[PDB]
Design a protein around this motif. Structure first.
Motif, PDB file in Angstrom:
ATOM      1  N   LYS A   1      37.888  34.434  43.391  1.00  0.00           N
ATOM      2  CA  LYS A   1      38.408  34.494  42.209  1.00  0.00           C
ATOM      3  C   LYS A   1      38.143  36.119  41.428  1.00  0.00           C
ATOM      4  O   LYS A   1      37.123  36.545  41.749  1.00  0.00           O
ATOM      5  CB  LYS A   1      37.423  33.363  41.391  1.00  0.00           C
ATOM      6  N   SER A   2      38.105  36.577  40.813  1.00  0.00           N
ATOM      7  CA  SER A   2      38.998  37.651  40.268  1.00  0.00           C
ATOM      8  C   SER A   2      38.538  37.362  38.261  1.00  0.00           C
ATOM      9  O   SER A   2      38.748  36.565  38.045  1.00  0.00           O
ATOM     10  CB  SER A   2      40.470  38.344  40.255  1.00  0.00           C
TER      11      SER A   2
ATOM     12  N   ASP B   1      38.640  40.361  34.805  1.00  0.00           N
ATOM     13  CA  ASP B   1      38.707  42.122  34.545  1.00  0.00           C
ATOM     14  C   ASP B   1      37.884  42.381  33.416  1.00  0.00           C
ATOM     15  O   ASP B   1      36.669  41.384  33.732  1.00  0.00           O
ATOM     16  CB  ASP B   1      40.017  42.316  34.021  1.00  0.00           C
TER      17      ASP B   1
ATOM     18  N   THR C   1      39.890  45.237  36.948  1.00  0.00           N
ATOM     19  CA  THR C   1      39.396  44.547  37.943  1.00  0.00           C
ATOM     20  C   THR C   1      38.623  44.354  38.568  1.00  0.00           C
ATOM     21  O   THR C   1      38.336  45.465  38.917  1.00  0.00           O
ATOM     22  CB  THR C   1      40.605  43.196  38.112  1.00  0.00           C
TER      23      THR C   1
ATOM     24  N   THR D   1      36.514  41.476  41.161  1.00  0.00           N
ATOM     25  CA  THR D   1      36.545  40.117  42.072  1.00  0.00           C
ATOM     26  C   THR D   1      35.382  39.899  43.146  1.00  0.00           C
ATOM     27  O   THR D   1      35.326  40.821  43.871  1.00  0.00           O
ATOM     28  CB  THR D   1      37.882  39.583  42.982  1.00  0.00           C
TER      29      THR D   1
ATOM     30  N   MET E   1      35.796  39.859  46.981  1.00  0.00           N
ATOM     31  CA  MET E   1      36.131  39.375  47.443  1.00  0.00           C
ATOM     32  C   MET E   1      35.590  38.996  49.142  1.00  0.00           C
ATOM     33  O   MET E   1      36.016  37.480  50.016  1.00  0.00           O
ATOM     34  CB  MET E   1      36.020  41.025  48.425  1.00  0.00           C
TER      35      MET E   1
ATOM     36  N   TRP F   1      31.505  41.201  44.227  1.00  0.00           N
ATOM     37  CA  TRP F   1      32.124  42.136  43.509  1.00  0.00           C
ATOM     38  C   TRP F   1      32.716  43.567  44.295  1.00  0.00           C
ATOM     39  O   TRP F   1      31.683  44.173  44.301  1.00  0.00           O
ATOM     40  CB  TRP F   1      31.228  42.511  42.020  1.00  0.00           C
TER      41      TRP F   1
END
Length: 61
Positions: A25-26, A28, A43, A45, A47, A51
């Motif tokens: 999920k991401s 900003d 942004t 996320t 990964m 983050w």
């Protein structure tokens, strides 16, 4: 498996402060006037290791 907790930026707008996001999920990250995420990112996320951009809105000015 590696969930990502959204940290607290001192002088930024922690829209989703104190929220856990599942890997993939991401979100900003906005900061106060004069600050911005590293490498001119907007942004961040989860990964894999966490983050990926790393949510730290360093002062761009």
């Amino acid at each position: 498996l590696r969930k990502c907790y959204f940290p607290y930026l001192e002088n930024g707008y922690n829209q989703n402060h104190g929220r856990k996001f599942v890997q993939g999920k991401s979100i900003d990250v906005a900061c106060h006037p004069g600050y911005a995420l590293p490498k001119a990112q907007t942004t961040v996320t989860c990964m894999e290791n966490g983050w990926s951009p790393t949510p730290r809105c360093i002062r761009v000015k």
